Homo-oligomer: A and B are copies of this chain.
Amino acid sequence: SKTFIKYVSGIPDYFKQSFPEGFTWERTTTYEDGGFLTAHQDTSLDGDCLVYKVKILGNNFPADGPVMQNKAGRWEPSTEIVYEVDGVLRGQSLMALKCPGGRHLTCHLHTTYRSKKPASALKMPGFHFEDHRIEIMEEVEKGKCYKQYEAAVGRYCDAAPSKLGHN
């Protein structure tokens, strides 16, 4: 839901620039215990409302693992690196699912974001980070209804500055 990012430091906003047409994204997430989760998404604007259409294919999750046992804890916050490739945007991130027994089950996201505007109508962002805080606020109904919060920030590495004038 990439329209909702706070960009700082003058970083161009690939997602907001893509309206009214919208954008798509495609992703494969690899889990360290063998699962894969692949998704495709279309984002459009219907009058005043953003509309998402999502297709998902997941496989190879171990039967005895936290995911298929439904014995996961929560996502740590994560940081994605985002940069231009092939005239569109690539993202990658490591995410970590806290799980019972002091375990972290990690995964690696490989994403392509594709504006529906031509690349010539767009101001492309340089390499940067996108922090994502994703929280399940409540499991309203076991296995049937969830509430999920996200806060996201697009930024450079401000904590450890360059000595060469680099972002």
Give A contacts to B, CB under 8 Å.
26-28, 30, 32-34, 36, 38-40, 55, 57, 59-60, 62-64, 74, 76-79, 81, 83-87, 90, 92-94, 96, 98, 102-104, 106, 108, 110-112, 127, 129, 131-133, 135, 137, 149, 151-153, 155-157, 159-164, 166
Closest Cβ neighbor of A28 among chain B residues: B36
Decide: B110 and A86 in contact? CB cutoff 8 A: no
Residues of B within 8 A of A159 (CB): 131, 153, 155
Copies in the complex: 4
Contact A157 B77 (CB under 8 A): yes
Q: Which of B30, B63, B79 contacts A157 (CB 8 A)?
A: B79
Given contacts A85-B103, A151-B160, A161-B133, contact A57 B55 (CB under 8 A): yes
- Hey, which chain B residues are within 8 Å of A83, CB to CB? 96, 104
A135–B112 contact, CB under 8 A?
Answer: no
- What are 19 inter-chain pairs, A to B, with CB distance below 8 A? A27-B59, A28-B59, A30-B30, A39-B57, A55-B57, A59-B110, A63-B87, A77-B160, A81-B96, A94-B94, A104-B127, A132-B160, A133-B157, A135-B163, A135-B164, A137-B164, A149-B163, A153-B159, A153-B160
